[PDB]
Design a protein around this ligand. Sequence first.
Ligand code: HEM
Length: 328
Amino acid sequence: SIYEQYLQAKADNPGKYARDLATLMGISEAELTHSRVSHDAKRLKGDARALLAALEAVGEVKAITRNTYAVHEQMGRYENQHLNGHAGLILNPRNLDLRLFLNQWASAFTLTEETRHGVRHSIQFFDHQGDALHKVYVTEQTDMPAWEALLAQFITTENPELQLEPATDEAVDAEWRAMTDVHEFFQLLKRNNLTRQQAFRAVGNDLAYQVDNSSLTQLLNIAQQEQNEIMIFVGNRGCVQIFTGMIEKVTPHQDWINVFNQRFTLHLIETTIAESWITRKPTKDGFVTSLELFAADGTQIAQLYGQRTEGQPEQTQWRDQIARLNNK
Ligand code: HEM
């Protein structure tokens, strides 16, 4: 059925990934994946936490989190998990470091597909809107018997239909200044019913200011030359993946900017950066500064920070690097 369209669409669009085909087909990626069940996909029990916890057993994998404009690929292990809440963590600085908003995790599937590049095995998680949250791919280092055993436990014969779904500047400013830690920002936005960009515009320019759209490239190239550790956050509504480390290679390619490290890859569509902001948020160890990028539709494409550990102030080198960017 819809599977038949997918096959045709795929035939007709070889350089497009599932996410792109789904859009072409007028449907969510989750709905597309649901249609592939019995063909090259199987439905898994929709228990994010159980699946996540179980992944600790498989060892090395390739984790992918993305939004429309950026893709973050990290090699690592689902260890050091802390999921007893809506805000979950997989805490591995410099390796697989995830921040999870578990209330957004709706469905899960497993695929074994033939691609233009070979056979890939994965587990894919989708949100309530049917968008991809997170993907886990098998690698040469994955513990296969453990992966196979996890699937045996989580695969379900049933494939139920998916239940998809759809004031003052001065005060905002004072609330932002009153924060004691960055993590309080989400509640800040929630209580004033604001988007990140809307809050940025409301507050003082010392707290949030615009820089040129070329700022990302400038920053990545500066970090690559200086070899200071930085952090790159790429996320979506239910998941944020964080790279921490030195930038080994940055390479632009047409509309893209890429970071190629041994165990991390960033693919970002530079040309979609519509607004670039520098923001500063308070913490017990002082202010922390980040570069935040947004697409025309308001999507946060990515965000950068300098490496930091609790009880240490913001990196000086980072602060100096940000200082070299051009306003406007
Ligand atoms: C408790 C262990 C955690 C550690 C050690 C940690 C570490 C960090 C660090 C170093 C930063 C950069 C800002 C700074 O230097 O302070 C940051 C920001 C951030 N964290 Fe955490 N984090 C933790 C928990 C969480 C959790 C549970 C979530 C969500 C589930 C989360 C989501 C984020 C987000 C989205 C940012 C960017 C903040 C912004 O500027 O909007 N973190 N974290």
